[PDB]
Every structure is written in structure tokens, then in C-alpha cells.
Write a protein that binds this ligand. Structure first.
Ligand code: 7LD
Length: 263
């Protein structure tokens, strides 16, 4: 099937274009070099690595339908898929925690020396944790056959799905609704279109993260404890589309990012 090549190649190109523009914008503009924007750059790097390393072999699987490369190559492919997707999800959770620090710890957030240490620790933790989650697949824990490159371990699927998605998902959800409650509290305590804008952004980021990743993981848990395969593939491609949409929703609304993208 050569019909998948076009569509999936445009998806890869869209992801690469958006994340590269975010990285170039943050690097070039001195006003944009802040620690929250460095968390955004970490998310963009995760998405760019998804598009560059992981997705091209996923296109190969769709086109050829069978794995005609080495078995160790298949192991690298699956562990890279898990690692980069987990890194993207954990970067989203880190951005949520940073935005919470902005609202509930305004004085500590403003301090440069403490904020640098916080963000360097968060970036290190998310990347190390994604690597440690993905590493057992390198050990031949996956049981793929010679023809096909897939993950056939239900136990690893459940255990990695939990730590990689569910608890960062619950944490991000609780953190964002906490930010919403604090925003409403200060709105009651106290032009005003910015206050509705903040609500819009929280709803948009939550909705994108729910729609793109939740169906895939819930389908995995339901499967491991029948459903057709085409929607399974589409659910995986939705998770990949998360990487396409993240650099839009996390930068294109902010004005300073728009100026850099125009320039
Ligand atoms: C069809 C077979 N493939 C391709 C290698 C998968 O199932 C991939 C397995 C994933 C997976 C399992 C378990 C935990 C996880 N966290 C993050 C991901 C993940 C990414 C996720 N990708 C998108 C698909």
C-alpha cells in the first residue's frame, strides 16, 4: 500500500516543521530564553525525535506490512517509540507543574536561581524516567516474531502504560484543575478577556491531551484485560498526531512566539 506513504509523510513533515520552528524561535530571541520556554523546547525535542526516528519505521510497517530488517533493529524501534512518546507525555506533565508553580508559588517562580534548578531537575527527571521505562524492551523482553515487529508482552504493556500515561495523566489533570480553581479564586477576590483566554488555553491543552492519547491506552488496557484492528491503528496514529498539535497549542497563542515565527 503506497497510499499511506503520502499522508503519513505529510504528518511527519508537519511535526518536524512545527517543532523546528519552536526550537529556532526560542534559540534566536533573547526575550524568549526563559525556563518555561526551555520546558517547551524539551517537549519540542521529544516530538521532533518521534517524527525523525520512530515514525519512519511506522510508515514502513504500514506500507510493507511485515518486518524485513534485523530483530535487534525491531527492539530499537519499539524502545524508541515507547521512550519518545513517554518523554512527550512527561514533558506535558512537567509543563503543567511549572504553570502550577507560576500561580501557587509566584515568588519562587520569579527567582532565577531557584527556577533554573527546578527546570533542570524536571527535564533530567522526565528524560531519565522515559529511558528507564523503555529500557526493558532492549533486553529481549518483547516477544516479536521473525516476520512482525510488535510488542507481545501484556505484563509490560500494563506496567509501562500505567507509569508512562496514567499517573502523569491524573497528575496533569489534577494540577490544571487546581490552577483553574486558583484563577477563579483570585477572580472572585479582585481587559477581562485575558481571564477567559486562560480558561480557553487550559481547556484546549487538556482536551488535546485527552483526545489524542486516552483512546490508545484505554484500548490497550481493555485488550489486555475483540475490537477491529483499523481503529487500533488509527488510535496509535492519533497519539502520533499529539506531537503534531503540541507545538501549535503551546506556542502559537503566545504573542512573543508569534513575533518570532513571523520574523
Ligand atoms: C503497534 C505496535 N506499537 C509500535 C511499536 C506500539 O504499540 C507502540 C507502543 C506504545 C506504548 C506501549 C506502552 C507504553 C507506552 N507509552 C508510550 C507509548 C507506549 C507509545 C506507544 N506507541 C505509540 C505505539
Amino acid at each position: 500500500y503506497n497510499y499511506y506513504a503520502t499522508l503519513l509523510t505529510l504528518l511527519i513533515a508537519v511535526i518536524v516543521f512545527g517543532n523546528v520552528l519552536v526550537c529556532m524561535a526560542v534559540s534566536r530571541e533573547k526575550a524568549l530564553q526563559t525556563t518555561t520556554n526551555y520546558l517547551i523546547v524539551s517537549l519540542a525535542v521529544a516530538d521532533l525525535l518521534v517524527a525523525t526516528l520512530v515514525m519512519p519505521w511506522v510508515v514502513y510497517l504500514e506500507v510493507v506490512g511485515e518486518w524485513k530488517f534485523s530483530r535487534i533493529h525491531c527492539d530499537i524501534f519499539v524502545t524508541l517509540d515507547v521512550m519518545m512518546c513517554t518523554a512527550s507525555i512527561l514533558n506535558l506533565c512537567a509543563i503543567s507543574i511549572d504553570r502550577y508553580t507560576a500561580v501557587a508559588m509566584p515568588m519562587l517562580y520569579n527567582t532565577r536561581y531557584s527556577s533554573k534548578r527546578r527546570v533542570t531537575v524536571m527535564i533530567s527527571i522526565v528524560w531519565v524516567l522515559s529511558f528507564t521505562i523503555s529500557c526493558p524492551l532492549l533486553f529481549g523482553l518483547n516477544n516479536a516474531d521473525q516476520n512482525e515487529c510488535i510488542i507481545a508482552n501484556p505484563a509490560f504493556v500494563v506496567y509501562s502504560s500505567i507509569v508512562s500515561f496514567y499517573v502523569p495523566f491524573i497528575v496533569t489533570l489534577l494540577v490544571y484543575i487546581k490552577i483553574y480553581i486558583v484563577l477563579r479564586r483570585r477572580r472572585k477576590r479582585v481587559s477581562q478577556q485575558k481571564e477567559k483566554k486562560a480558561t480557553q488555553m487550559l481547556a484546549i491543552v487538556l482536551g488535546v491531551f485527552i483526545i489524542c492519547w486516552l483512546p490508545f491506552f484505554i484500548t490497550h488496557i481493555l485488550n489486555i484485560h475483540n475490537i477491529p484492528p483499523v481503529l487500533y491503528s488509527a488510535f496509535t496514529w492519533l497519539g502520533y498526531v499529539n506531537s503534531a498539535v503540541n507545538p501549535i497549542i503551546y506556542t502559537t497563542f503566545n504573542i512573543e512566539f508569534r513575533k518570532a515565527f513571523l520574523k
